[PDB]
């Protein structure tokens, strides 16, 4: 909520599309990520108190999932490469500066 910077979209359906299932997403996780934190977990998503133990079972889930990219993808189905500029705005040295006059 305190991030100062970017969110920027563009269609990579013109490029990233194939069949590319390497593209992936976290469909479910048990909390929100901390500021700028990532969740790398390939761990089993555990729905019941029955431990899955690294195999599939009743409501045994791998939480991360993939987007099948269908080269007929439309505006709702197109991937958007998206970028976000982290910065604190002020209170630290100029790293990215402005083009000074």
């Amino acid at each position, epitope marked *: 909520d305190d991030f100062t910077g970017c969110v920027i*979209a*563009w*269609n990579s359906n*013109n490029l990233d599309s194939k069949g590319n299932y390497n593209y992936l997403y976290r469909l479910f996780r048990k909390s929100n990520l901390k500021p700028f934190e990532r969740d790398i977990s390939t761990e089993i998503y555990q729905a019941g108190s029955t431990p899955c133990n690294g195999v599939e079972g009743f409501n045994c889930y791998f939480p991360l999932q993939s987007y099948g990219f269908q080269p007929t993808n*439309g*505006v709702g189905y197109q991937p*958007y490469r998206v970028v976000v500029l982290s910065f604190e705005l002020l209170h630290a040295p100029a790293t990215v500066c402005g083009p000074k006059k």
Partner: antibody
Amino acid sequence: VQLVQSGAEVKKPGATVKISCKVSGYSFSNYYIHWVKQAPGKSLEWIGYIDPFNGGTSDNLKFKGAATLTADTSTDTAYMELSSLRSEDTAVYYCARSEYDPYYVMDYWGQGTTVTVSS
Amino acid sequence: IVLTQSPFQSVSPKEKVTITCRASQSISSNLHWYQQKPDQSPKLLIKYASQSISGIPSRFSGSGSGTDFTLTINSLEAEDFGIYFCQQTNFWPYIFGQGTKLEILK
């Protein structure tokens, strides 16, 4: 369904105009607002989009008024502050209801705000 | 990432007119058509380049092929014609058509 703008603003060039887009008839927080400029007898020109929940003000770079789109969530009113006014900024400024998801439709708008920037 | 329209089209009632929206380089399969009456807020005719917002005449259609997006009107009425706009989708600035004033003769 209802977007009502502050009336015409006549300034000297270099001065500042801020224009109110007052939402009613729908949910403000569920819709971005597009801000659309029509120079008199000229085409539709889109200065930026704003977010109700955030400072979601993108700016087109064709002209530059040091513009910032502020949305007042209590009154559901997005402002467009257009500074560094120029005689060409003279135009009818529409605000346009935008989707909140990344789909961009402006179905319904303000009534337009003429600004005459001149000495 | 800028789009091109024909400045003017003159047609007769019942005749079919097609106004093009021609975007440079890549195009986005969404587009938005607007009928601006003189001195009046343009109104969105065509959404996604394939659909009408509700209440808009069935003679108002839209499309795209290659880099062009058409504003296609079938069977005009002398009430219908007006200034027409297309709006680029995505690619940063929604770059609105230069506008097309439609005339209907007869």
